[PDB]
């Protein structure tokens with residue numbers, strides 16, 4: 545039957561998996577927990593059969609899985625998108641972790657009261673990270689060529705996210721901008737983003753110092 | 763010719779890759795940068811041919827690679843250790859990210875002046891993370907059975923590391939303790955740990971609030 549994807553009803557860790565499932569035109573159900581609903585989760589937490597209980601979880605009946613990167617790589621794996629030979633698979637994994645750099649970087653410093661003096665710091669590093677993708681896309685449509693791999697949706701979510709921190713960070717990175725529009729112009733992604741299903745906010749969990757609330761940026 | 767592994771001469775991100783190379787009895791050379799030696803790196807940084815310049819890097823001549831997880835998964839991949847089918851590969855990736863939870867968790871909070879009020883926090887979560895591995899090993903020799911996979915050396919390094927934060931954190935987790943002794947009793951790991959090659963400290967980069975210096979714990 546339909547896979548279950550469970551996470552908080554935020555963007556957070558699972559957003560790229562959602563966009564990949566949407567792109568692959570795959571059926572899945574979600575358990576979203578809303579913010580009053582910790583208790584819900586803590587209960588079910590250990591009755592679900594996960595060996596490493598966590599959120600997000602992905603249950604299949606081939607598979608019960610709890611790490612966001614194990615989940616997105618599995619879905620991709622199931623569709624042959626993962627690699628191809630050690631070299632190609634390493635390519636994709638290096639792209640993966642090159643965008644976690646950016647995205648986990650937001651997250652390190654969201655939740656600090658010190659966010660604001662932290663922010664200024666992390667924005668000095670951003671453009672050097674960005675330039676690396678911009679250079680990558682200087683001759684490709686997608687991160688790995690003419691074909692969407694899972695890290696393209698990781699990068700879309702990173703870009704989506706760092707644009708709330710500093711709406712000007714992609715002036716200067718015109719390929720990166722077009723890449724963004726390009727993902728939004730895939731018709732499954734277009735549909736989904738118009739969907740009742742699309743969770744537009746928060747970026748992180750509701751309590752965080754940036755991306756939280758049910759809000760506005762910074 | 764021999765692969766090059768470049769990192770700071772600390773344990774840090776690359777320690778599990780080193781132990782895997784050692785276990786697989788593979789030849790590699792390292793470029794270690796010492797602490798006076800930022801400038802060294804920044805120079806070479808962009809003359810090395812890495813598409814995403816970073817440390818650690820791994821150069822092969824099939825491959826120039828810069829994300830620690832892309833590097834260790836490649837070396838493992840090259841030796842067939844990675845997976846086997848989408849399900850098995852997801853198993854290994856979930857174990858991977860279940861131990862980054864612990865290890866990146868140290869790292870989040872090393873480098874803060876607030877480490878000490880941060881420490882107390884993170885130690886409340888540790889035992890719940892630990893219990894998950896302890897339960898996992900309750901019937902296996904290694905994380906995935908009777909055979910070492912790359913996440914076993916990830917877990918060894920995590921354990922090695924959280925033992926400096928709280929030398930008592932594994933009283934209570936006797937399987938975890940034996941797993942540690944068990945990795946140290948593999949003869950390639952035994953040799954290496956006795957080696958001139960073994961970098962015993964620092965755990966993180968020299969400037970960090972825990973695991974830094976050329977030191978003692980906490």
Ligand SMILES: O=C(C1CCCCC1)N1CC(=O)N2CCc3ccccc3[C@@H]2C1
Pocket residue numbers: 611644645648649651652858859860861862863864865866867870
């Ligand atoms: O614990 C982790 C793991 C959890 C398991 C799956 C892998 C990551 N973290 C979570 C986290 O918040 N950060 C802070 C930001 C950051 C930046 C660079 C490198 C690492 C990190 C870590 C990664």
